[PDB]
Amino acid sequence: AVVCQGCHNAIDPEVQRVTYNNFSWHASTECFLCSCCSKCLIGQKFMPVEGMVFCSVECKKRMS
Amino acid sequence: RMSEQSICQARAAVMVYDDANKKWVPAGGSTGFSRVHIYHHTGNNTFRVVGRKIQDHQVVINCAIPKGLKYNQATQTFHQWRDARQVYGLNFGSKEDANVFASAMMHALEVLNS
Numbered sequence: 015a016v017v018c019q020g021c022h023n024a025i026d027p028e029v030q031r032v033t034y035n036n037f038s039w040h041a042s043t044e045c046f047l048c049s050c051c052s053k054c055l056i057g058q059k060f061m062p063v064e065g066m067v068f069c070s071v072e073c074k075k076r077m078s
Numbered sequence: 079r080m081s082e083q084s085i086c087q088a089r090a091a092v093m094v095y096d097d098a099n100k101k102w103v104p105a106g107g108s109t110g111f112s113r114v115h116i117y118h119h120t121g122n123n124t125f126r127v128v129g130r131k132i133q134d135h136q137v138v139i140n141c142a143i144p145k146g147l148k149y150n151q152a153t154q155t156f157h158q159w160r161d162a163r164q165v166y167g168l169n170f171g172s173k174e175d176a177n178v179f180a181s182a183m184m185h186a187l188e189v190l191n192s
């Protein structure tokens with residue numbers, strides 16, 4: 015029983031989910047999003063930093 | 079004239095708990111991380127949490143800090159507190175953002191409980 019890093023709600027123990035370190039996001043609802051511009055990153059290029067993900071180098075630097 | 083003092087700047091996705099749908103939801107109605115400050119009015123020694131969306135600077139939280147705010151560090155990256163209306167949540171970008179905000183919150187409460 016895990017909590018989503020995107021929406022802070024439970025992820026169903028049975029379903030498949032996005033994982034990076036001790037972070038998990040829902041893979042079906044819009045939770046795996048660029049922390050800056052909210053772009054859905056499922057299947058996309060992404061740049062993880064602790065609990066955040068981008069998108070692009072532009073969104074990343076915007077959050078320095 | 080003396081503008082309010084920002085005593086911390088953390089990155090968090092600001093959230094509220096939606097009771098009717100028994101889940102957490104984004105504050106202001108949309109996803110995205112915010113820059114979250116504690117502002118200190120040095121004239122009166124009053125404090126508030128102010129959070130502005132990183133993409134467009136939409137204000138999603140503007141919350142006074144009372145003497146005796148119960149600040150709940152629920153997880154290492156998720157902290158929360160309530161008032162009579164809402165439960166506010168901060169989903170930090172990292173443990174460092176969280177610890178930095180919590181220290182500023184305790185400093186605020188230090189001054190408020192003097």
Ligand SMILES: [Zn+2]
Pocket residue numbers: 018019020021022023039040043044045
């Ligand atoms: Zn989610």
Ligand SMILES: [Zn+2]
Pocket residue numbers: 043044054055056
């Ligand atoms: Zn999607």
Ligand SMILES: [Zn+2]
Pocket residue numbers: 048049050051052053068069070073
């Ligand atoms: Zn982005």
